[PDB]
Each structure stands twice: as structure tokens, then as C-alpha cells.
Amino acid sequence: HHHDLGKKLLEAARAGRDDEVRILMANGADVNAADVVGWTPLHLAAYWGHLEIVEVLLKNGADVNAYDTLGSTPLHLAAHFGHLEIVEVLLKNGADVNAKDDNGITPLHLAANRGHLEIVEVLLKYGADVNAQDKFGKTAFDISINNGNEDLAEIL
Amino acid sequence: GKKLLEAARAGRDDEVRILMANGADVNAADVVGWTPLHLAAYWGHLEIVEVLLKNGADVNAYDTLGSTPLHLAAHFGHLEIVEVLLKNGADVNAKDDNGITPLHLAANRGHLEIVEVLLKYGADVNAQDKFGKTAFDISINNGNEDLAEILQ
Amino acid sequence: APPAVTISASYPGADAKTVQDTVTQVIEQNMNGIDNLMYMSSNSDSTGTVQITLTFESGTDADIAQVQVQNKLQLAMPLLPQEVQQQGVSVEKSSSSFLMVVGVINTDGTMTQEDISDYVAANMKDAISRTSGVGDVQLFGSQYAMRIWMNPNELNKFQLTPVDVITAIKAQNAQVAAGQLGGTPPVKGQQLNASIIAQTRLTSTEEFGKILLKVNQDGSRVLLRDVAKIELGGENYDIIAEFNGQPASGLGIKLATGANALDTAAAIRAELAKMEPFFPSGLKIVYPYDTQGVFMTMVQLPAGATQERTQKVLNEVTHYYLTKEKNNVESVFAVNGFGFAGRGQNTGIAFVSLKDWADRPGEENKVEAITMRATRAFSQIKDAMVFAFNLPAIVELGTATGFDFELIDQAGLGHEKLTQARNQLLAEAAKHPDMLTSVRPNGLEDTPQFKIDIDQEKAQALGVSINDINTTLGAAWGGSYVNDFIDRGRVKKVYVMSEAKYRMLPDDIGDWYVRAADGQMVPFSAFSSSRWEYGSPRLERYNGLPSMEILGQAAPGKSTGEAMELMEQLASKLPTGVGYDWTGMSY
Amino acid sequence: APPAVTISASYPGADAKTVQDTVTQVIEQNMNGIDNLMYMSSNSDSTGTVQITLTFESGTDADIAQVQVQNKLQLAMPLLPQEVQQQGVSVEKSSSSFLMVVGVINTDGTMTQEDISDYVAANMKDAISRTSGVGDVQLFGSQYAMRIWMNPNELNKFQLTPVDVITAIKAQNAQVAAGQLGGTPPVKGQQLNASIIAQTRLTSTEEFGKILLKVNQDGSRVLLRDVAKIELGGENYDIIAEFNGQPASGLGIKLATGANALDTAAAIRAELAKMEPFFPSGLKIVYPYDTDQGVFMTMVQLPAGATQERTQKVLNEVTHYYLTKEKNNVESVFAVNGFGFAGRGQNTGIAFVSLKDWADRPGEENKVEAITMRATRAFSQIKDAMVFAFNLPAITGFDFELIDQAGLGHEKLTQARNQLLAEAAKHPDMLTSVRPNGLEDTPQFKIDIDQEKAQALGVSINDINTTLGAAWGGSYVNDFIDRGRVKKVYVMSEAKYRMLPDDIGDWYVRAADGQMVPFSAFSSSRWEYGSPRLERYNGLPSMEILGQAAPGKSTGEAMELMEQLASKLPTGVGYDWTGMSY
């Protein structure tokens, strides 16, 4: 899971260039090409919220559960930054809903921290362990108490 | 009674007596609880102290922190006014909210003349404040040799 | 108009004496060796503000004068309190009067006065301040700060003081320089190079609310929102403006010395045109004072008057223009807390704009007739000086008929004896109506102040440090500038201060606790005592010595020199050590 | 040309946002009351550097503009971090282009690049900087500092942190004012008057090595050399230069606004003649850039994130081309890695090219114009690097600024920039090469300190952030004396303990109870994206955009389209014309 055209694809997937990613995928570019920090084109597409590119890469066999060098997956990034549509599609294609990074942080933790209520519901819907704790022993509910998010604490 | 508070402060004897001839409250107070007797004793207007007391001014009036017009006169070296207040019945041992007596304020400023008059009227030389200090401790802490021996 | 350079400094929570003795005097003692300087004057206010005015001979280059004043001020800067340096000391070369007032309102009523004032400070004031020819910009309101309103009951419940709050805010609202991975010099062959990002400035009340103050031994957490209310609010709450009775803010703009008034006005409007398309919904610029067609009304209540009482008088002034003169008056821009004589809870000003010249036919509908009737009607207002005046027309009268007198303490007599000497001169001047009319002080009267004495022996015996006592007292009752934060991409201040209800009455002093060295909480009453006394809310100084400005006019017929001559005679009989000089017109 | 005053400041180890939010905004907010200011622009870099450019109306006295800016900056100095004040801030009134480059090499090869750079910084730069007409001097290198390269393993072994090292250096590298024997006022009959001499600045690596950190409970001593390597080394290591492939340093000199270019160059040459007789053996001055022209420049810009090693490879091929293909035309190449035409960074470089005598380059194909374009074409086949050669005297399409007018923030402004960039690409008949002038966001390492865990263990957050910053960013501790000259002392982790994310966990902080706590016990980390360079224009966040009119189209026509394109941008995004387009 720790992964020129492969480097062309990573730049195209970041800037949202839907035509060029189709061009490079049709020319044998590596779908799972990683940069120096371990981010794949799926990582960058999930980070910068490019939904169409997400679906294109997973169609061509992109590792939905790719790890970066700190253990973070594209579902971590999508849940952290409020990209609900991508969070859905990632879970559709077998994204580990309980993936922990090196800190023990799950996508539920990140969605809870930034208060993305709808994403928290989609993650729970797919079986996210509501009692998963990070390295500091914090659950998604602990995060809502410290943040004062009464709406989140009720959803949980 | 606000105009009399202003009158007793600026030191205008003539205005003041117009006000009680017109019936202004001799015990009127501003927001800090200072009667016209307080104001006259502070700025050292002897004539108004005498006139106000003549018209029934509360000689033991307190402000919001328990200070009397005798405290102000003893503190600021008004020997003429401490006499006039003590003859009219100022509590020579009056304590404010901090346990400070006019003997404390007089001893601190080195007003040895007022210290004698206070003692003569029955000032408790052993009176302490909230910090347990007496007028003698003040004389020792200030280095006032003469004031120190007047309290034995 | 002789050119004048102005030094302004701020000391939050400081009284007039503290300002004068820790800021004003240090600066003034260095204001020598400056070319073409005629005289120097200063005010030190219990608003915590000082203004030093240095007036130069006509023909002096304002650029050179500002440079020479600032170079002497640099000698004093390292001696000034850090609280004063942090507020930003300003040196300006501007006219004393307003060239124009830019008003800002929200026609949809979806923004409070506090909201409008912050929008103007954060999106409008700076670009105007950088416009060439703009010598000074006065905000009629205050930029938002992050306000931490402390609760002394909750702080005592958790053995916490404002010192702990201030310390936690400095630690947890921080911008950390953390280095890089793969920075130079690297191990050769290094591929990765990335900045390390650690803590960054907090950006919202939510973030400040969850600053961690302490962990109890049982594991529970004490957050900042548990001991304080947290909200955006003005750096200060002293200046509040209204436009035709509706909430408003604005910029008072003064012209830089020697700058062209028409060119500068055009640059300001051109700069405003750049910002309008990005206003939020409902915000609108209005123009309540353009420099006849306009005039001002000053409002001066006795020292000690609250902002609520000043607002009542401004309401009466605004009512008059909006009802009695509604056929002549186009708009009123009233400012509470800012006056002709500076800033304070007991002053205010109204800018009045009239309708078209052709829309006001008749003798009785011109500025002089209107201001005369207004001042006569405002003569009725008691416990407040209210005067309506068109600025160029009273300069003319004063210049031709008035004088400007300075009573100077030249022997260390002190403020109280200088007051006594002033009153002796004022009462004697009242005995000569044939030569002098309305001899009056330009300053303020002494007011009751709350004097608190920290018993050093009790504090040492209990293990309570003086720094903690003074920080707790000053932060709670005066407010304390802690550090900066980022509000919507703009650096702004963070202030801690008691919530209002715990800093209103003298018995609230006892509600505040300081933690001793051994951990015990000690109330303020255990090591302090207090009493009422009188003191000044505005200490004046002239040419570096304590002073009291006295104004007046010659009697009908008698010349200015005859009125000045009698003042000098009267002055010669004042107590020893009291001198005098002539300033302003009389110079 | 309208005069420009430049403010420069540095914050060692700070990222671009830290620089912008503690320095740049503070200075901008206090640039009021200055006459004839046209506009203001700023860059805040992840090298820890801010540059603010104040451009004034044509005809403005540059002397007056500089003084007014300096005075306003003086009043704002107490508002800046102490770490920035103590680096010294500069305010200059000079052209943006170089008047000349003074190159220094060692013919005997007995001095390395860093030796030469220190010699120039310590023996040459200051006298050049004081020459009349010299508006700015760039050192192509760094002055030596006393470098304390900390070892986290040995620090933990003796239960010490960088805080302990910094405290001991300040205590034992000190200059003490101690008074006099028989000082005034004296007793009567005093016969002896003499200065008391207490501690004095250390002067050598050996003196720093024996700074005493602690005495163990058994009696043994822990010296600074037991937890660190101590050596002379540059204040920073970002700028290295070469002259025809050989190690070199030098001074880039810019002409002060309004000075005479010829008179200033002659004064510089006369100053250099005074220094030459005292050079160490082998040291020689070369003159690789003196302003056909006979000279030109070549700029190298790699994508943000590129290392110094990779930029050096690109500079090598640029130099190689001039030293082989243009053998008969090129006299010299002075190449600088880490310094660029605009700004400073590990991903930028510049080469100054000097041509042989005009008489020895006959033919139109051997003149500056034909050579520079041949070079640009040859360098256009270089992968992932913008490389082109150009000219610039000692004293064009359009220049466009996208402005955040409503507090939108960096991410939203980037999106609006990209939206406008894609729209301009769909009009190739009118606009060409519409591109951003700035840098793209790059991966950064976001570390979160857990306040609860730190307090639960009794670890002070100040000790944590000092340990992190001193180890990975470096810290200016105080000054020392190197061969009679005041220079700086820096502490920082030795390179091999600050290269990889795993190294974070090798650093320990001492808790109140005396226990050592690793960074992993109270911190967590993740990758994210952020800006290596933040721009502002007239006090608001901004993004500069360059472009040119298409062939057979007027510049005013191209600017008309850009304005119409910008009007359809998201709410709160404004724009302004600047520079050539003003």
C-alpha cells in the first residue's frame, strides 16, 4: 500500500485537468505513482476535491487504500476537508472506513474535528468504529465535546 | 443638594450659606458618598466646615468606604479643621473599612500638631488596622523620631 | 496656520498621572535641539492617551520638522513602557481640523455599530491612511479584538488568576517558526524538502474557547470558555457614532501640512471607489461633512460623566437638528466619546451638513443664523457645554478678539497648588468685566479616584508576588493586550479583561484572587486597603512644565493688547513659583 | 522610472505564513502617513524572508521617501518578533537590477567556497556597502557563524535539551561590564584605578567546546562538545557560487536610485584596489558582470520543492553550454545557486555571462542578441525548469494583480486565479503566456502538539517549541568574536538528525519531574499543502499574473479582455494593474 508519465499524472490530477488524466491513462501512465511524501494521484484528487478525476482513476485500478509515508489514505483527506461526494465514491470502491494513520487517527476523527456532519453520517453508515481512539485516547465523541459541537455529539 | 456639594468644594463661602438659607440638604452626598463636610475638610475650607456644622451637618458621616470628614482633615494637615470637627463630636477613634483611624493618617504624614490634638481628645494610641499596625509602627517605619516619642 | 507635528501614544488602563510620568515626561525631556520650534504642549489623559503638539514657525518644512521630532523621540522610545510601545507610537504632520468625514452605514440594518466599525477598520482605514496628503485618520469606532471577558468566581473556583489566562493565551495562540525537513545543509542525496508547520495563530472564538488552562488530578479539563466569555469586540468601547439616528461608523480625515485639499479629497474618493464593489450586503458610504454648507457642534460634559449621560445630550442635539431645523439640515453625524478636545466618556461632536444653497433662501437660513439659533437653544442644556459653530468663522473671531493664556508651574509646586493659583487668577479676573469677559480654563476638573495601597509586608508574608498582584488588578480592571490573532486574514489584537459586572463597584475588588507561592488563593482584601481621593483626568504641560490653559476675550471695545496687559498684572500677584506665557493667537 | 524603497527582514526557520502574519502584515499596517506612495507589494517566503516594495510617484525625492519609510518602520519595530529585530531590518533605495558583480576566487585552490564567502563577508562587503552610490549589496555566499550542531542522542543521554544548550551559551559566551578598581566616586587617598575584566566573548571552536553544561551527581562534567559538533560555518547554506566551474564567492552590487553608474563603479574599483594587497595567498578578484552590452544573465527556476542538489544539476548544464557550445564568444560564467532573478530559494539560480571582446566576436550571429536567443532555444529543451537568457541595464506585456478583497483566504484566491488562468487560455487569439509570477503550494509537514498530554506529563510548551525550532530551524543565540570581528552564534541539529519525519521522535524534552519525554509522546503529524511564498498588494492578499498580447493585437486590447475576464470571477475577488501596466 506504500507505493515521467507517472509524474505527469500526479501533476494533472492535482490541478483538476480532466482531459490530460484521460490522455495519460490511455497511454500507460502508472495509476499508483507516488511522490516524495507518498501521495498518489488519488491522494491529490481527494485532497483538492476533484470528483471526476477520483472516479476516473479508481476505474483504472487506483489503490483506494493507498498509504502515504505517515499512514494517511485518500479517505482521510476527503473526510478531513468536507468532500462528501468523494467520501461516498471512495467507500463505494472499498475504502477502509477504519483506516488509522501513524497517529491512530481515523477518517471519522478528522471529519468530526472539522465538523463535517454529513460525512460523519456516511462514515458511520459504512461501519466506522465510533469508539476508535487515536494515540492520545480520544474518540470522535471526545472531539465533539472539546469542540462544543452539540450537533455532532447527538449524531454520535 | 448637588449645587452645595459643588459649593463646599470650590471654596465659595457666600454661595454655601445661601443654600441652607434656602434649605439645601446639609447631608447631601455624591456618588462616592462624600457629604459637603467631606469636601470642605478635603480642600481645607475652614469657614464652610464651621457653617455646615452650624446647620446640623453629620459630623460622623461616612463615605462608601467608611471614611469620615475627620479622616480627610487629619490626613491632609488641616489643624484648624480637626479642632472644629473634634469639638463638634467627631469620633476620634473612627475606623474605615480598613481599620484606619485618623491617628494613622496623621502619623503617616508627620502631622505632629494634629497627632497631639487627636491624642488630647482620647485617640487610642494602641489602635491597629487590618494589618495590625499602630501609629507607633508607622513612626518607626517612616523614621520620624519626634512623632515616635510623642506616642511613648 | 503654523505647521504642527503631533506625537500620540496609548497606555491601556493608565490614569493621567501614570501617562504623564512614564511616557509624556520622558519624551518631552528629549524635545530640544529641534530647528524652528516655537512651543510645545501636551495632554495626558485618564483614557490612557497622551498627545504632544510641537508647533513650528510659519515657513518651516513639515517634512523636516517631522523628521527632527521623530529623531528626538527615538531617544525616549526604549525608556517607554512596553505596553505603550506595543500600541504603536505615532508621529504625524497634519492640520488639527477635519478635511472631510467618510460615513458608513448599513441600509439593510444587518450590521451593528460594532460590526460596521470593524469593517471600516479592517477593509478601509489602512488604504485611506496611505493616501498621499492624508495627515491623520480618526476611526469613529474601534476595530474588533478577540475579547476574553474573565469571570473572577470561576477563576477562583479553579485556583486560576488572570496571569494564568495570559500565560495560556501566549502559549496556545502562537505562531511557531519550526524549521524544515531537508533544510540546508542537508545530508547529500536528500530528496525531501518541506517546511515544518507547528502552532499557528488562532482565528476564531471557538479556538480561543478551547485553550487548555489546566488538567485536574482527577483528569478533568479546565478550558478558557469555562472561566471567561469569548467574543469579537472593540479594542475599546469609547467611540460610538450615529448617522441621522441610525448606527454608523466613519473616518475623520485631516489634511497633511501643505497638501492640496482638492487633490487629496479626489484621491480619497478614488480610493473609496475601489472598495465599494466588495462591500457586504447593505453597506453604504455617506458624506456627512465636506469642507459654507456645514458646521460642527461640540458637546462637553463635566469630567466623571458617563457615556450614557453623554448620549442623552447628543440625542437632544440631534433631535433639535432633525426636528427644528429639518428644512435646513440634510444630515447629522454624531460621535459619542470623541470631541474637539480629544477623547473621553464626557465629550462628543456632531457634524451637520445642510441642504443645497439655493434650497435655503433667506437671511435666517444661512450657517451663521442657524448656528446662532442652535447655540442659543443649546444654552438651555444644563450640566453640559454645547456650542454650534462654523469652523472658519470662529477662528476669525477668536483670532481678532481672543487670547490664549498658560499658567505654568515653575517651581515644583504640584498639581493642587497650581489649581489653587488658577482659581485665584480666575476669581480675580471676574472682578474686571470692563476689560476681560468669560475667563475660563480649557481643561478638566479633578474627579474622585479610587486609591488602593498594596501592603508590601502582607504580600511578602503570604507569598504573593507584586507582579502577580499588579497584573491581576490591571488586566481585570483596565484590560491587557496579550498578543495578536488572525481575524479573516488580518492581524488583530487579543485582550483580556473582567466581564463588566465584576469591575463596576468598589466591593468587586475583593472578588479577585491571586495565587500565592504555596498555592493558596489570597483575596485582594487580604493585602490591600483603599480610600477615595481626588485627581486629574487631564494633566496639561507647556514647554515641559505643568500648566493650565486659560482662555478669554477682550471686553467690547478694548484691544487685545489691553486685555493681555491686565492678565499679566493679575498674574504678578499669584503665589511664588507660578509663571505664565502666551500661546496660540497671543504668541 | 518611479523610485522604489525596499524593506527586507528575516525570521530564521519561519515558514511563509509565519513571516506574513508576524512581520509583513504588521509593517504594512504601519506604512501610513508617507507622501507620494503609488503602491505597495510584498513577498513572504518559506526561507524566512520578507521583502516589501514601496513604489512612489515619478519625481519623488528618493531621499525623502526612504527617510519617511525608515521612520515609520522604526515606530513599528517594537511590534515585530524579537527574532526578527535582532537579525536587523534593511531599508534601501536602489535599482532592482545589478550594476556589477565582484567575483572572488582562489587561484591556488587553497580556500573552499565557504572560506571565500566568509573572507568576502568579513573583509570586503562592509567597505563596499559604505561606498557612495551603492544601494544594495548581495553576498553570493554567507559569513561564518559559530555553528553548534546538536546531537539529540547525546542530549537525551545527559537529559539535556536545546534550551539548556542555549542558556549555557548565553551564560558562558558573555561580555561583562564589571566596573573599575578605584572607580568614581572614589574614597579619599585612592591610589589605583584600573578596569575590571570579567567574562569576554569566546573566539574559537575550542572555547565553545568547553562550555560547561552540567556536572553529573558523581562529579563528571558534561561539556558542549560532548553533545554537539562545533565548527565555523555559514549563517545559512542556501547560496553557493561558481566562476567557470571553480569555487567562488562574490558581491552583487545595485546602483542607488539617482546615483551615477560610472562614478559608482569607479569608486567600487578604487575600494577593491585598497583591499587586494592584504588578500591571503591565492585570492583574486574577477569581474564577471559589468554593465553591444557584452554581458547578459540566465535565470533558472525549478518547481517549488526542488532541492539545492537538483538546482545545481540544472546550473551545471547551463554553464556547460556556455563553456563548450559558446566557447568562442563567452569569456566567463558566474553561476549562483540559491539566488534567483526574483527572490531566494533552494529551487532557483542565476548565471551572469560575460562575452569576449566585441572585436573578437565578428558577425551578427556572434552578438548579444543572437547569442541569448540561441541559448533560450537550447535551454527550452530542459525538463522541469524554466531557463532563459535575457538582458537588464543598471537602471514587455502586462502586469496584473488578483486581489483578495473580502478575506477569502489563500485557498479561495488560488481557485479564483486558476479559474481566470483557464479562461485566458481559451482566448489564444488575444492572450499569450498568461501565467502566475509566484510559486505553487507544496507539501509541508504539519505537526500538532497535544496540549493535554504535555501538561499531563509536566512538559512546558515553550520547551517543546524551542526544542523543535532550534533543532530543525536553527536559533541565533548571541554574538562572538571571530578574528576580531563580531559574528553570530547558531545552534541547530546536525544534518542527519533533521532529514526525515522519523527523526522527530528522536528529540526529547525534559519534564518538570526531570524525566525525558520524546516528541512522539505528545505530538502527531500529517502531510498538507501550503504556500512557499505569499504575495500581497496594497496590504491585501494578492497573486501576480503575467501575460502578453497575442501576435497582431494591441496591448490595450489584451488588457481589455483581462478586465472583462476578471469581472466574472467569484465574489470578493478584485484586481489591479501594476508595474508596466500602471
DSSP for B85-139? HHHTT--TT---TT---HHHHHHHTT-HHHHHHHHHTT--TT---TT---HHHHH
**Residue B61 grid cell:** 458621616
Q: Give dist(CA C72, CA C56) in Å, integer.
A: 15
Alpha helices in C77-146 (DSSP H): 82-87, 113-123, 125-129
The amino acid sitting at C434 is D
| C531–B65 C-beta distance less than 8 A | yes
The resolution in angstroms reads: 2.1
Q: Residue D570, preceding bond cis, omega within 30 degrees?
A: no
C191/A contact by beta carbon, under 8 A: yes
- Is residue C556 within 8 A of residue C397, CB to CB? The reply is no
In C, minimum Cα distance to A36 occurs at C192
User: What kind and span of H or E run contains D114?
Assistant: helix D113-123
Residues of C in contact with D52 (CB under 8 A): none
Are B and A touching by the rule of 3+ CB pairs within 8 Å?
Answer: no
| C214–D449 C-beta distance less than 8 A | no
* CA-to-CA separations, C416 to B5, B43, C14, D434, in angstroms, rounded: 19, 9, 20, 73
State how far Cα C326 lies from the chain centre. 32
**What pairing do the DSSP bridges indicate for beta strands C528-535 and C447-454?**
antiparallel
| C194–D444 C-beta distance less than 8 A | yes
| A111 Cα to chain C: minimum distance (Å) | 17
**Residue C1 grid cell:** 496656520
| C275–D472 C-beta distance less than 8 A | no
| D68–C70 C-beta distance less than 8 A | no
Which single residue is written with the C-alpha cell 500661546?
C583
**Residue C178 grid cell:** 519550526
The amino acid sitting at A12 is A
| A33 Cα to chain D: minimum distance (Å) | 16
Of D418, D501, D529, the CB nearest to A69: D501
| A59 Cα to chain D: minimum distance (Å) | 26
C209/A contact by beta carbon, under 8 A: yes
| C82–D465 C-beta distance less than 8 A | no
In this complex, which chains have at least 3 CB pairs below 8 Å with chain C? A, B, D
C518/B contact by beta carbon, under 8 A: no
SS3 assignment, position D494: coil
* CA-to-CA separations, D157 to D163, D222, D227, in angstroms, rounded: 15, 11, 9
Q: Give dist(CA B115, CA D52) in Å, integer.
A: 69
- CA nearest neighbour of A81 among A53, A38, A57, A51: A51
The dihedral region occupied by C373, where left means phi > 0, alpha psi between -120 and 50, and beta the remainder, is alpha
Are C and D touching by the rule of 3+ CB pairs within 8 Å?
Answer: yes
In A, minimum Cα distance to C220 occurs at A146
SS3 assignment, position B6: helix
Of C192, C194, C210, the CB nearest to A146: C210
| C312 Cα to chain B: minimum distance (Å) | 19
Which single residue is written with the C-alpha cell 519623488?
D60
Greatest Cα pair distance, chain A, in angstroms, is 50
**Residue D529 grid cell:** 499543502
- Breakpoints of chain A, after residues (C–N > 2.5 Å): 3
- Count of alpha carbons within 13 angstroms of residue B77, beta-carbon side: 5
A72/D contact by beta carbon, under 8 A: yes
B69/C contact by beta carbon, under 8 A: no
Q: Give dist(CA C296, CA C387) in Å, integer.
A: 8
Q: What are the backbone angles phi and psi of residue C335, rounded to the nearest 5°?
A: -125, 115
| B122 Cα to chain C: minimum distance (Å) | 24
In B, minimum Cα distance to C507 occurs at B65
A137/C contact by beta carbon, under 8 A: no
The amino acid sitting at C293 is G
Q: Residue D485: exposed, middle, or buried by beta-carbon count in 10 A (0-12, 13-18, 19+)?
A: middle
In A, minimum Cα distance to C222 occurs at A146
In A, minimum Cα distance to D414 occurs at A15
Window 3-42 of A, Cβ < 8 Å to D: 15-16, 35-39
Q: Give dist(CA A23, CA A6) in Å, integer.
A: 12
| B63–C532 C-beta distance less than 8 A | yes
- Is residue C296 within 8 A of residue C352, CB to CB? The reply is yes
| A134–D527 C-beta distance less than 8 A | no
| C160 Cα to chain D: minimum distance (Å) | 15
| A92 Cα to chain C: minimum distance (Å) | 33
DSSP string, C302-363: PTT--HHHHHHHHHHHHHHHHHTTTTTEEEEEEEEEEETTEEEEEEEEEEEEE--STTS-SG
| C66–D499 C-beta distance less than 8 A | no
Domain range holding A138?
1-156
| B98–C529 C-beta distance less than 8 A | yes
| C206–A148 C-beta distance less than 8 A | yes
Residues of B in contact with C531 (CB under 8 A): 65, 67, 71, 96, 98, 100
**Residue D421 CB: number of other CB atoms within 10 A?**
18
The amino acid sitting at B47 is E
- CA nearest neighbour of C193 among B118, D105, D309: D309
| A147–C210 C-beta distance less than 8 A | yes
Residues of C in contact with D443 (CB under 8 A): 194
Q: Give dist(CA D351, CA D338) in Å, integer.
A: 11
B98/C contact by beta carbon, under 8 A: yes
What was the structure determination method? X-ray
Q: Which residues of C288-299 are buried (b: 16+ CB within 10 A; e: fewer)?
A: bbeeebbbbbbb
B129/C contact by beta carbon, under 8 A: yes
Which single residue is written with the C-alpha cell 524551542?
D466
| C529 Cα to chain B: minimum distance (Å) | 6
DSSP string, C28-73: HTT--S-TTEEEEEEEEETTSEEEEEEEE-TT--HHHHHHHHHHHH
Q: Which residues contact D146 (CB under 8 A, 6 or more apart)?
A: D202, D205, D208, D230, D232, D480, D482, D487, D488, D489, D490
SS3 assignment, position A84: helix
Among C191, C195, C260, C481, pick the best mutation site for testing chain D contact (most D Cβ within 10 A): C195
Q: Give dist(CA C63, CA C60) in Å, integer.
A: 9
- Is residue C560 within 8 A of residue C554, CB to CB? The reply is yes
| C448–B30 C-beta distance less than 8 A | yes
- CA nearest neighbour of D140 among D204, D64, D234, D45: D234
Q: Give dist(CA D163, CA C497) in Å, integer.
A: 33
Which single residue is written with the C-alpha cell 493585602?
C527
**What pairing do the DSSP bridges indicate for beta strands C144-150 and C490-498?**
parallel
Of D409, D472, D539, the CB nearest to C196: D472
- Is residue C415 within 8 A of residue C539, CB to CB? The reply is yes
| A36–C210 C-beta distance less than 8 A | no
**Residue C268 grid cell:** 480619497
Q: Residue D501, preceding bond cis, omega within 30 degrees?
A: no
| B77 Cα to chain C: minimum distance (Å) | 14
| D529–A101 C-beta distance less than 8 A | no
SS3 assignment, position A26: coil
Q: Give dist(CA D521, CA D464) in Å, integer.
A: 12
- Total CB pairs under 8 A between chain A and C: 13
**Gap between the terminal Cα atoms of chain C:** 12
User: What kind and span of H or E run contains D265?
Assistant: helix D261-275
The amino acid sitting at C242 is E
**Gap between the terminal Cα atoms of chain B:** 45
- Count of alpha carbons within 13 angstroms of residue C570, beta-carbon side: 23
Residues of C in contact with B129 (CB under 8 A): 529
Q: Give dist(CA B49, CA B39) in Å, integer.
A: 9
Among C172, C206, C208, C215, pick the best mutation site for testing chain A contact (most A Cβ within 10 A): C206
- Is residue B79 within 8 A of residue B117, CB to CB? The reply is yes
Q: Give dist(CA C440, CA D50) in Å, integer.
A: 54
The dihedral region occupied by D238, where left means phi > 0, alpha psi between -120 and 50, and beta the remainder, is alpha
DSSP string, D348-387: EEEEEEEEPPGGGS-SGGGSHHHHHHHHHHHHTT-SS-EE
State how far Cα D358 lies from the chain centre. 36
Q: What are the backbone angles phi and psi of residue D47, rounded to the nearest 5°?
A: -80, 0
**Residue D373 grid cell:** 536567443
- Is residue B129 within 8 A of residue C529, CB to CB? The reply is yes
Alpha helices in C149-202 (DSSP H): 152-157, 162-172
- Total CB pairs under 8 A between chain B and C: 33
Q: What is the number of domains present in chain B?
A: 1
SS3 assignment, position D564: helix
Which single residue is written with the C-alpha cell 497648588?
C417
| D128 Cα to chain C: minimum distance (Å) | 27
Of C529, C532, C534, the CB nearest to B130: C529
